[PDB]
Design a protein around this ligand. Structure first.
Ligand SMILES: [Mg+2]
Ligand SMILES: [Mg+2]
Length: 386
């Protein structure tokens, strides 16, 4: 981030907070470890005002008491001598602040953070995948029926421009009997592979419901299906992933190991640098965008891949698209089709397995000021003044 244009008199004038609500296009069922996710979605949003101009973005871990202590601070003082937002402000304010900087400079965040030296202008187009393939089949006793239902769901995404798909597996860990559930996982993946076709990338996500041998059984069953990655087969463990990697190598089966969401092992990155994990999946909100810019740099330096987790928060989708400009080995935007009341994302569009990020200021999302003001006053909160 270049902050040489930030004037020292620009101060945080107001911070306001509200929870926006919406719905995903199709209700999401269970996954390997927990129950139905549902259709309702929310996004916690803050609106910051600095030098008479507003910026909007995701905000977490912020209380009115915390914000009260930030009012009156100079924007410059929120940054490192290296142009990086200080740790203390990231979760609460990085998104509103980055949006703000984009509004004030009239640039999309991707241009602010890319560190690019070549002339800008080229449209930002980023691979994405459909993450919405949950255990939506559990009400069906028949395996073939289950496959057909999941194929239809994949087709729904395909019609909306999705070409790559992540399929939840691990049905036998908790929700179905172990052996039947595992057979069904395999059959569903095969079925979706037929939908996606030869250029469609297929990922599977067990949400830790497998163990090493169950994982080997599933992978062997799916030899003829080109799987792009295997995500959270079981809780990350250097010894188990070392084994799996060697096993995959012996079979010449090319499947990336992906991990890192939730409460990750504190040694996961170490394990990745030693070759046990290929794709890292820390969440786009926590630890966040600034963190990911630094992490992405380190991962790039080791030839490791970045695939920020995003689920449960629609805002993170658009953030992920912008982050891609700052990380060489950026894999995909994890996409969930969500409509949030008051959050106009129409500048973005999906086409042929890619999300086209608009070149408009900040994150290119236009919030409904009046609705947000209502929500702030009704249930949210406000600190500072105009
Ligand atoms: Mg996952
Ligand atoms: Mg994990």
């Amino acid at each position: 981030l270049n902050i040489t244009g930030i004037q020292s008199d620009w101060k945080v004038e107001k911070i306001e907070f509200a929870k926006l609500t919406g719905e995903r296009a199709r209700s999401a069922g269970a996954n390997g470890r927990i129950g139905v996710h549902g259709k309702s979605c929310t996004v916690d949003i803050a609106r910051i005002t600095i030098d008479g101009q507003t910026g909007y973005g995701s905000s977490i871990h912020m209380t009115p008491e915390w914000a009260e202590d930030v009012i009156g601070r100079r924007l410059l003082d929120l940054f490192d001598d290296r142009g990086r937002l200080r740790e203390a402000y990231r979760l609460q304010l990085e998104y509103p602040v980055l949006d703000w900087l984009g509004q004030r400079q009239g640039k999309p965040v991707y241009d602010l953070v890319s560190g690019a030296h070549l002339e800008t202008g080229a449209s930002l187009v980023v691979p994405c995948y459909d993450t919405s393939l949950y255990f939506d089949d559990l009400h069906l006793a028949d395996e073939r029926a289950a496959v057909a239902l999941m194929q239809e769901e994949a087709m729904q995404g395909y019609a909306k421009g999705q070409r790559h798909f992540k399929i939840k597996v691990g049905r036998g860990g908790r929700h179905m009997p172990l052996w039947e559930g595992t057979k069904r996982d395999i059959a569903i993946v095969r079925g979706i592979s037929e939908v996606a076709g030869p250029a469609g990338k297929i990922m599977i996500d067990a949400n830790n419901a497998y163990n090493l041998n169950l994982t080997k059984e599933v992978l062997a069953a799916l030899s003829d299906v080109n799987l792009y990655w295997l995500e959270e087969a079981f809780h990350e463990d250097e010894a188990l992933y070392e084994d799996l990697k060697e096993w995959l190598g012996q079979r010449g089966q090319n499947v990336l190991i992906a991990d890192g969401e939730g409460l990750a092992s504190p040694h996961l990155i170490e394990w990745a640098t030693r070759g046990r994990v290929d794709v890292l999946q820390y969440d786009i909100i926590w630890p966040g965008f600034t963190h990911w810019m630094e992490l992405g740099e380190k991962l790039d330096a080791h030839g490791l891949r970045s695939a920020p987790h995003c689920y449960g928060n629609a805002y993170g989708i658009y953030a992920s698209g912008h982050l891609s400009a700052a990380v060489r080995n950026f894999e995909f935007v994890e996409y969930d089709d969500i409509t949030i009341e008051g959050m106009d994302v129409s500048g973005y569009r999906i086409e042929n397995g890619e999300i086209h990020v608009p070149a408009t200021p900040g994150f290119g999302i236009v919030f409904d000021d009046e609705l947000v003001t209502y929500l702030i006053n009704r249930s949210g909160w406000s600190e500072g003044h105009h």
